[PDB]
Design a binder for this molecule. Structure first.
Ligand SMILES: O=S(=O)(O)CCNCc1cccc(O)c1
Length: 658
């Protein structure tokens, strides 16, 4: 339908603009819609963009406002002193500031719906909150309102929450427009969603993006399909992949590389209140940290991820056990039968389940899918679902059978409660994925296996060598295969660090020369160097000019195919901040052919220094553009947990970076 008020081209330079004369008398009915197209690339700490208020002395808590923070958060206040109502809804990390040097036109649609008693906020096509209340306070029904205001809120004759920005177009509707009509509002977005709430994954949250340009020109992406908030394991997580055959313009409905079925693929809205936000799915198996590589020889695509059995993760993973028993040179998967006190079982070749205590083979075997068969008949357990209907998290049997899996809670046979690493392969460049296979241990029978570094493996351009970086305490454990990932060996490389999330990524500077950038605990990104195509590694050094917080963040790195300023070019993707995960950057480095030193020459801010930027993925697209798929939020902060559609893709060209 049609607007009751329409204005635009408003400049908010720390002075409010009065539109009361024009707007107020047009207000009528108890449901309303706001449509605001605005820019803020130098926001103040906290500012109102728009406000209906009672400006009369002693009614300072009678106003509606649409406010933002310089961290990118958006919200409304709906306060009526005389109704004893002070509503406040918001979601951190909902905005854009700048892109390619230009102010982003952000599009905001707030719906106040008096029949459903529900407020709803959209920003650039993304629903960022939807709240129902017992008691609806219409924004036009606030007692004694007498001002409509832009760039401030007029309380008691003074300008509160003064804004620095601009509102290019604002519209108003004495109606609560439908979710469908919203979608027909044109957007001016500089980003895209690859995976997204409501897609085939049916996961509401995504984390840990990957990107990898296949040789056909297909660009591939994997990611954590995180169901139980954005928590790490323990939780439910699946690995999902999508691809683009058009240089990152469009992307395929995603499929699963790695998946478990003990728990329903549920789309939950995870509570963001302090009392509940640390609810955690606790009985589910899960995957986490995918990394991708393409093998030149067989043509196959290879994808690895950390694997976690039911209830298990970083903090409670049985260290001092690999989960395997080594009998005569070879490694065998340990199991525990229901009702035992110990792992009196192993999984030998062709799956056969052996009781160790009597050395006898049993009637059970283990299929490719790590499923249990008895007598060659596959057993089933019941699926679980979760809900917050009782008010806390509740995990309950949903009356649906699924094949029994040795990683599940209800399995007759259970793996060792620690962390593993699995691979899968695609023969069709991400249109399907084979059943995953466990990698063997590398650091011994009595050590929990390492941790996969999420991102890309390196395929060495002049050999058949495939390399996947992993980390554990004290060292980067590189995983080398020269036979299409059919067999693996480890190349260890000490680092001056204990208990670091030493997430490592590699570039090939020239044939056989691998430099690996990695996350530390010192606030500075580290690096090392191999010159035998990964056989041995240098001591550790650090980068100056880039800053990270003490706990640090994953860093993505690539070898640019083209020469820049006449020199070999490396590109780095990372937050540049000592305070949190924000101030995203692409940093371009030229190599010194004399000593292999890199001169960090160009810094490109992905968005404002105060806007969240976390885990990231970078690829060189077949048209030589650069694709960036990243966590556009502070995925460390406890205040920005459980946001939907914050992993975003952008397209960049080199000249944008310089
Ligand atoms: O905590 S973050 O730095 O945001 C991400 C860490 N992910 C590490 C990890 C790997 C495997 C299992 C986990 O529970 C956790």
């Amino acid at each position: 339908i049609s607007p009751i008020f329409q204005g635009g081209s408003y400049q908010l330079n720390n002075k409010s603009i009065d539109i009361s004369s024009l707007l107020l008398d047009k207000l009528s009915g108890e449901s309303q819609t706001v449509v605001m197209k605005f820019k803020a690339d130098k926001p103040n700490s906290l500012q109102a963009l728009f406000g209906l208020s009672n400006s009369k002395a002693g009614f300072k808590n009678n106003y509606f406002s649409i406010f933002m923070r310089d961290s990118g958060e958006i919200g409304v206040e709906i306060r009526d002193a005389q109704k004893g109502i002070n509503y406040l809804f918001s979601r951190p990390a909902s905005l854009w500031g700048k892109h390619k040097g230009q102010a982003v036109e952000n599009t905001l649609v707030f719906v106040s719906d008096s029949k459903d008693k529900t407020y709803t906020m959209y920003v650039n096509g993304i629903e960022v909150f939807s709240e129902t209340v017992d008691t609806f306070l219409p924004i036009s029904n606030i007692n004694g309102i007498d001002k409509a205001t832009l760039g401030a809120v007029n309380r008691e004759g003074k300008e509160h929450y003064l804004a620095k920005g601009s509102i290019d177009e604002i519209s108003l509707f004495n109606k609560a427009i439908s979710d469908q009509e919203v979608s027909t509002i044109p957007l001016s977005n500089p980003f895209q969603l690859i995976f997204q709430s409501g897609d085939s994954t049916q996961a509401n949250y995504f984390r840990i993006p990957t990107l990898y340009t296949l040789s056909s020109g297909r660009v591939l992406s994997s990611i954590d399909a995180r169901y139980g908030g954005t928590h790490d394991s323990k939780s439910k997580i699946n690995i999902a992949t999508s691809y683009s055959d058009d240089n990152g313009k469009t992307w395929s409905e995603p499929i699963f590389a790695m998946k478990f079925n003990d728990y329903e693929e549920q789309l939950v809205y995870w509570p963001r209140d302090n009392k509940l936000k640390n609810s955690q799915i606790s009985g589910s198996a899960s995957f986490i940290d995918s990394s991708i590589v393409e093998d030149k020889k067989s043509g196959k695509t290879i994808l690895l991820a950390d694997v976690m059995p039911a209830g298990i993760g970083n903090n409670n993973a049985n260290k001092a056990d690999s989960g395997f028993k080594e009998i005569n040179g070879h490694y065998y998967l340990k199991l525990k039968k229901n009702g035992d006190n110990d792992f009196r079982y192993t999984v030998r070749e062709n799956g056969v389940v052996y009781n160790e205590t009597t050395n006898k083979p049993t009637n059970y075997t283990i299929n490719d899918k790590y499923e249990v068969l008895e007598g060659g008949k596959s057993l089933t357990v019941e699926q679980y679902s979760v809900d917050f209907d009782s008010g806390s998290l509740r995990e309950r049997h949903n009356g649906k059978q699924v094949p029994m899996n040795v990683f599940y809670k209800d399995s007759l046979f259970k793996v060792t409660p620690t962390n593993y690493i699995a691979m899968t392969t695609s023969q069709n460049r991400g249109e399907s994925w084979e059943q995953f296979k466990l990698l063997p241990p590398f650091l011994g029978e009595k050590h929990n296996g390492t941790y996969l570094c999420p991102g890309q493996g390196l395929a060495l351009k002049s050999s058949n060598r495939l390399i996947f970086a992993t980390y554990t305490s004290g060292e980067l454990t590189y995983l080398i295969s020269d036979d299409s990932g059919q067999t693996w060996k480890k190349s260890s490389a000490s680092i001056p660090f204990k208990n670091a999330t030493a997430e490592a990524q590699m570039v090939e500077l020239r044939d056989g020369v691998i430099r690996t950038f990695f996350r530390t605990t010192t606030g500075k990104i580290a690096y090392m160097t191999s010159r035998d195509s990964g056989e041995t590694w240098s001591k550790v050094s650090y980068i100056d000019g880039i800053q990270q917080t003490s706990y640090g963040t994953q860093v993505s790195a690539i070898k640019y195919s083209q020469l820049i300023d006449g020199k070999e070019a490396v590109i780095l993707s990372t937050p540049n901040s000592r305070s949190g995960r924000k101030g995203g950057q692409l940093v371009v480095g030229l190599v010194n052919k004399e000593d292999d030193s890199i001169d960090w020459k160009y810094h490109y801010d992905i968005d404002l220094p105060s806007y969240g930027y976390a885990y990231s993925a970078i690829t060189e697209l077949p048209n030589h553009h650069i694709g960036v798929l990243f966590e556009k939020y502070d995925s460390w902060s406890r205040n920005e947990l459980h946001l939907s559609n914050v992993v975003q893709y952008i397209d960049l060209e080199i000249n944008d970076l310089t």
